[PDB]
Amino acid sequence: AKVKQTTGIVGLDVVPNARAVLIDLYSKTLKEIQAVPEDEGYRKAVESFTRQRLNVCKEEEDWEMIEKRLGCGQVEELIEEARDELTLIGKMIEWDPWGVPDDYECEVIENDAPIPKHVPQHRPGPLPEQFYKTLEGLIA
Amino acid sequence: KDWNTVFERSINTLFLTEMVRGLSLTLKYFFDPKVTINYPFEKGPLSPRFRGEHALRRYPTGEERCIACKLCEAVCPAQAITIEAEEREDGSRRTTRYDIDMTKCIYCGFCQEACPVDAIVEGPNFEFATETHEELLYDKEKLLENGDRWETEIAENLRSESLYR
Amino acid sequence: NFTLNFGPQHPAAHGVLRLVLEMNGEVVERAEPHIGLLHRGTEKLIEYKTYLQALPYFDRLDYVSMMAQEHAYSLAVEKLLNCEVPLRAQYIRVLFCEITRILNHLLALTTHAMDVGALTPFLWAFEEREKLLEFYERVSGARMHASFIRPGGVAQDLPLGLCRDIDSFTQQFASRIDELEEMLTGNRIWKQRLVDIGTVTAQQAKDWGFSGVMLRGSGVCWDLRRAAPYDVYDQLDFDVPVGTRGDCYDRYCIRIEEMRQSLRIIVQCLNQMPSGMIKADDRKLCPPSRCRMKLSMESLIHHFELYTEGFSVPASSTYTAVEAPKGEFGVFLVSNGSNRPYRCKIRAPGFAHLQGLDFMSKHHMLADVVTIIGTQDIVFGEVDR
Amino acid sequence: IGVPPNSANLTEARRRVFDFFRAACRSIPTIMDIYNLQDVVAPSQLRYAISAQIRNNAHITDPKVIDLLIFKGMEELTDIVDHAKQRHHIIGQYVVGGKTDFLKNFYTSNYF
Amino acid sequence: PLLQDGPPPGGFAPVRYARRISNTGPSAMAMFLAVSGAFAWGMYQVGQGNKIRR
Amino acid sequence: MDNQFIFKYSWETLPKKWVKKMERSEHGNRFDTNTDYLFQLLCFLKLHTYTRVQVLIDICGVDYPSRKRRFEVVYNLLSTRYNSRIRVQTSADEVTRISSVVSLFPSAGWWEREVWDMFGVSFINHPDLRRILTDYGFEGHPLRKDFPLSGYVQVRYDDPEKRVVSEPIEMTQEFRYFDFA
Amino acid sequence: MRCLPDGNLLQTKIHNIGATLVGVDKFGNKYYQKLGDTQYGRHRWVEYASKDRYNASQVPAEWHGWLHFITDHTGDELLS
Amino acid sequence: VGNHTAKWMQDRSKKSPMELISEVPPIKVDGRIVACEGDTNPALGHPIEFICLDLNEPAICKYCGLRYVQDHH
Numbered sequence A: 001a002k003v004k005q006t007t008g009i010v011g012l013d014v015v016p017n018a019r020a021v022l023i024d025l026y027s028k029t030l031k032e033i034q035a036v037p038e039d040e041g042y043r044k045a046v047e048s049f050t051r052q053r054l055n056v057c058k059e060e061e062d063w064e065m066i067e068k069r070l071g072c073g074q075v076e077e078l079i080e081e082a083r084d085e086l087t088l089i090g091k092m093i094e095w096d097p098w099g100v101p102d103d104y105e106c107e108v109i110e111n112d113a114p115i116p117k118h119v120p121q122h123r124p125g126p127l128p129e130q131f132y133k134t135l136e137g138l139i140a
Numbered sequence B: 001k002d003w004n005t006v007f008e009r010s011i012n013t014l015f016l017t018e019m020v021r022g023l024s025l026t027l028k029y030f031f032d033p034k035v036t037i038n039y040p041f042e043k044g045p046l047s048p049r050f051r052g053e054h055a056l057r058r059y060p061t062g063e064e065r066c067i068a069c070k071l072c073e074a075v076c077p078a079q080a081i082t083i084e085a086e087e088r089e090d091g092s093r094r095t096t097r098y099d100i101d102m103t104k105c106i107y108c109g110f111c112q113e114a115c116p117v118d119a120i121v122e123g124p125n126f127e128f129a130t131e132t133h134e135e136l137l138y139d140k141e142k143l144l145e146n147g148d149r150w151e152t153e154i155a156e157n158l159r160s161e162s163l164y165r
Numbered sequence C: 001n002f003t004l005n006f007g008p009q010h011p012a013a014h015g016v017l018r019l020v021l022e023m024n025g026e027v028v029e030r031a032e033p034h035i036g037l038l039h040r041g042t043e044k045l046i047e048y049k050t051y052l053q054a055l056p057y058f059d060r061l062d063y064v065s066m067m068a069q070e071h072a073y074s075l076a077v078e079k080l081l082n083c084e085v086p087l088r089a090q091y092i093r094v095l096f097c098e099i100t101r102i103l104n105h106l107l108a109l110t111t112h113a114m115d116v117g118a119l120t121p122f123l124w125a126f127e128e129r130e131k132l133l134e135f136y137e138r139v140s141g142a143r144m145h146a147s148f149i150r151p152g153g154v155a156q157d158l159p160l161g162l163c164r165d166i167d168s169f170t171q172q173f174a175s176r177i178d179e180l181e182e183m184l185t186g187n188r189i190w191k192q193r194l195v196d197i198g199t200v201t202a203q204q205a206k207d208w209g210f211s212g213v214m215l216r217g218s219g220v221c222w223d224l225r226r227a228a229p230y231d232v233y234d235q236l237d238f239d240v241p242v243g244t245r246g247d248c249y250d251r252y253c254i255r256i257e258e259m260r261q262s263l264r265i266i267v268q269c270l271n272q273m274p275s276g277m278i279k280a281d282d283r284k285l286c287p288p289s290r291c292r293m294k295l296s297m298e299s300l301i302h303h304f305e306l307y308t309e310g311f312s313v314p315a316s317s318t319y320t321a322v323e324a325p326k327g328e329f330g331v332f333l334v335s336n337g338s339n340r341p342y343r344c345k346i347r348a349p350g351f352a353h354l355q356g357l358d359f360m361s362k363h364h365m366l367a368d369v370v371t372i373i374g375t376q377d378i379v380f381g382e383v384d385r
Numbered sequence D: 001i002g003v004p005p006n007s008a009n010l011t012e013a014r015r016r017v018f019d020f021f022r023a024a025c026r027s028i029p030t031i032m033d034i035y036n037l038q039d040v041v042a043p044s045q046l047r048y049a050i051s052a053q054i055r056n057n058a059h060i061t062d063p064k065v066i067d068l069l070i071f072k073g074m075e076e077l078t079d080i081v082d083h084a085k086q087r088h089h090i091i092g093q094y095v096v097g098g099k100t101d102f103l104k105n106f107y108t109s110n111y112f
Numbered sequence E: 001p002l003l004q005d006g007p008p009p010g011g012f013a014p015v016r017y018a019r020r021i022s023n024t025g026p027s028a029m030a031m032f033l034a035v036s037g038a039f040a041w042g043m044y045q046v047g048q049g050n051k052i053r054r
Numbered sequence F: 001m002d003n004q005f006i007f008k009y010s011w012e013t014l015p016k017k018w019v020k021k022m023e024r025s026e027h028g029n030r031f032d033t034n035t036d037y038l039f040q041l042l043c044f045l046k047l048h049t050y051t052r053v054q055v056l057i058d059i060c061g062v063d064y065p066s067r068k069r070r071f072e073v074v075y076n077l078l079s080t081r082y083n084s085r086i087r088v089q090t091s092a093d094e095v096t097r098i099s100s101v102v103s104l105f106p107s108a109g110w111w112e113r114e115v116w117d118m119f120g121v122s123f124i125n126h127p128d129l130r131r132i133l134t135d136y137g138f139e140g141h142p143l144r145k146d147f148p149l150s151g152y153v154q155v156r157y158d159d160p161e162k163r164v165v166s167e168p169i170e171m172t173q174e175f176r177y178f179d180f181a
Numbered sequence G: 001m002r003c004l005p006d007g008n009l010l011q012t013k014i015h016n017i018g019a020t021l022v023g024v025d026k027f028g029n030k031y032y033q034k035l036g037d038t039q040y041g042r043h044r045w046v047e048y049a050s051k052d053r054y055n056a057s058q059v060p061a062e063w064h065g066w067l068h069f070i071t072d073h074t075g076d077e078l079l080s
Numbered sequence H: 001v002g003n004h005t006a007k008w009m010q011d012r013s014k015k016s017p018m019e020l021i022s023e024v025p026p027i028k029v030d031g032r033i034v035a036c037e038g039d040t041n042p043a044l045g046h047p048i049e050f051i052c053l054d055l056n057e058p059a060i061c062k063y064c065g066l067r068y069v070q071d072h073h
């Protein structure tokens, strides 16, 4: 419940009303995404993770609980991501990239040449469970 | 916040208290001994691995070690080595020309690593500045003179370094 | 607005630094660097070299952090070859990388300090630099361009007695760091020259491709040694210092702390250094011993092949990056199956950092431009290639 | 300011050509001053050289090639004006200020 | 051969890497008091010297 | 966020017409796209919540003379948010302008100038597209395979003109090409 | 008397005080050592035979390694 | 003194390597074969070369020019 004094990230101001801001942004997003065709995977992905985050925000009143349950950074970074998603939703309505062309071809390659253990390799660790729920919902 | 802390901040600002410590430890080094080397009477330390002026070597019999295999010419990253070779009058495989452009060379030591008979080496000399560019275009006879001049040190260094290579 | 054309034709400020500044009085309105004065066609030259002959080009890019670029190129080649490096070689590589980081940070900090008028720290630091150059020379026979780190491991094993001398250096280096700090850290003139100068937000740092200290100064916890570890960095304890203000003072403090953490890493490498081979044992990519080549046909043949044609690298392409002292140093290597790189793109952090000079120096005084250049740690060998 | 999209057809490409030619001609007095050409060559000869360069490429029909040629011409003009490399009878790539050719070439060398 | 350069049995002695704290230094009141007392007594002495010169 | 999740999620979420080729390999996840969709793809990857590809590490060209579109432009990108790297590539020829991404990544400015200098590929909407590495008035694009290693001209001081001048090259000892193949 | 104009030679004469003569080469150059610890125990130096026109290249190969701490063998032991 | 040596050697004060190696007498060997390494320490010489001594003429090591002959026959 204690107010945050710093995010520790230069230029990232503290947002003391982060819960209300997040709820408004997520509701705006869930409205504006309906301009995308329902069949498009982008719409389903956005609705999935946006609804999960919105439910977490609605349930939890303390922003520390929101940050903890989400596993996704400070509420300020969650706000940046929500604003960016809204911006992207606007550009995508305007681009109208949807549908599949008639003679659509796409080459997939799953190259399995191994690399040594000692060379630089990114190993972030497992994501929060919602990412995998979103992915499996997209596949199904 | 408090009269004492505000007073202590004001005094420290007015009396330049933190400037005193820099003066003091600058003065401490003033009386300590100096690290300067009295060149050329005194020299810096170097190792048996030091990559200096190339030299061509001979066997103790006087015969040249180089057999014109051209490996050093092939590996040289700077293309600073130029070799010509032919069958010598006694049938030996030997250079007629062995040039190193000291102004192309990057002093990497690859040629010494490539050589299968320890013929070309980078010796320990580093004091060979010249007044002309042409004196830095070493020919075979100059390299052999270098080898004759530095042979004892080169051999000692090779004995030392044979346990690593 | 008037235009001041500043080119310092001397290593006081780089040496090939060339800046066109638009000023409103003493206030900088726009800073435009002109580069290419050290563009030497490195990326074109590399395509004409075997993978071994190309290696010395990497010593000459950020020629203050020689072995780090050697390491990055070796790692890229190892990655494309699927080559396994022995553990002792891994430890030697990391040890030398952290020595290099100390060499770089000493030079950067004290050249910046001399630029803003503090003369003594330069001399003090360059004596320690001389000690570290001696370790370079003892292992490679060169003070600077060692060409010591290679695909498969390192060129030669450590000479007897080197680890003891390195330990002796580490026993006293902390006092040297403390002396540099007491000269600079608390001094009111030093703070007035660096506090709130060249402020960078985390968003700006990401937008302009900043890395290393330039990125960590803005509060972004990001270090490739932890994010994408290589060699034995995951077996080592060290902290990642991050800033809170994103200005020149924070970056200075971060560099000091990075030197302290590098000292820590070196001590750990010295204590954990194992015995064994320093070269990968695959006999198609590494030179045989001198005695083996003089005694065994297979060895002689391999030596001949390796020093004439060089090894082949199967057709592929990848990007490999390391945490160089100046930031993320990357190599985009394209192989076509032959013995020469088809394409070698070098990603230098100084290129991104110097591009950021315009937005960093906006609305600052003329005398702050050199401060901002110093905090960026620009070496034009890597900017221009 | 920014690099424009490729010309959609030959008409707009021709318009860009005319704009480039005007910009090149209007910079002639600056070039005369920078290279000190008052006693070396007339300004009209510079105009004539620019127009001749434009005319030698009059057979091009692809708008993209024309756009690239215009971009290169702009860069060359900028380097000539902003970063002049004075020689004597030469600005950039242009020389400023009874026997057939075979016999002359034969007297010269064996590589024609 | 079989001998390689490395740590001694037990490793090397521990080394400090963190900053050491030197000292606070002269007290503020002490400096204020020394300067103020020197000013007062010295100005009295200036008066005495001026009287003698007169 | 591992390279299996990125490959699968990008297949599920990206508009299909943006990606012609998708490679999953330890050498890096790779997306190939037509030139007309490069900008939108990069904007999507930067802005989307599940990708957050915020850092443009570099742009480089590769010359393939045997191809109708000889140039391949490679975009190396990084997500500090998810600790992941992505490579996005598109092909180009000598006269076809491709979109600049400066408005997406300010760091692209100089990398695009470099591609233009080295290879001759031009970038639409780039605010200041001029050579950045070569000498002023340089002719050609040195990183093209057909450009000779030593170039075409060299410089020397000319005492009669009292200046440094450029002449066609003359090599005392020519570069020796050792063919070990 | 060369000490007055040549301060470089003066420093060698001063630091020769208390030194041990290690050997003399074929050119007459004299080699001295101290066995202390000031420059991390590096206390080897050469007094050139020519008090004027001395030059670093006058050190012969047998003594060059000793002078540069490359080897602990003096010029005499190398020659034997 | 020959044409080969005259291409590089412009000093006649010393003997050329060809004359110097020719002055070394052939090494007598008990046996029909000998291995030459060019140095007492093999790692400091040349790759080992096995030389047959079946011919009456002295056999020459192709790396260091040392000559060998059969001691008895």
Ligand SMILES: CCCCCCCCCCCCCCCCCCCC(=O)O[C@H](COC(=O)CCCCCCCCCCCCCC)COP(=O)(O)OCCN
Residues within 6 Å of the ligand: B012, B013, B014, B015, B016, B019, C188, E035, E036, E039
């Ligand atoms: C036998 C030895 C004799 C030695 C004689 C010479 C002494 C050495 C003098 C040289 C010392 C080092 C010089 C280099 C420092 C130059 C930089 C000065 C910067 C400066 O003036 O800062 C101002 C305070 O100092 C000042 O203001 C300086 C003036 C201080 C006058 C004190 C005034 C009140 C004293 C109390 C009197 C009370 C008693 C009488 C009733 C405040 O500016 P800033 O921007 O740096 O702020 C930041 C504060 N951290």
Ligand code: SF4
Residues within 6 Å of the ligand: B072, B075, B076, B077, B078, B079, B080, B081, B100, B104, B105, B106, B107, B108, B109, B110, B111, B112, B122
């Ligand atoms: S030192 Fe390196 S560059 Fe110089 S000649 Fe030897 S191999 Fe070539």
Ligand code: SF4
Residues within 6 Å of the ligand: B065, B066, B067, B068, B069, B070, B071, B072, B073, B083, B114, B115, B116, B117, B118, B119, B120
């Ligand atoms: S110096 Fe060595 S590597 Fe070079 S040609 Fe002679 S024998 Fe071969």
Ligand SMILES: [Zn+2]
Residues within 6 Å of the ligand: H036, H037, H038, H046, H049, H061, H062, H063, H064, H065, H066
């Ligand atoms: Zn032999």
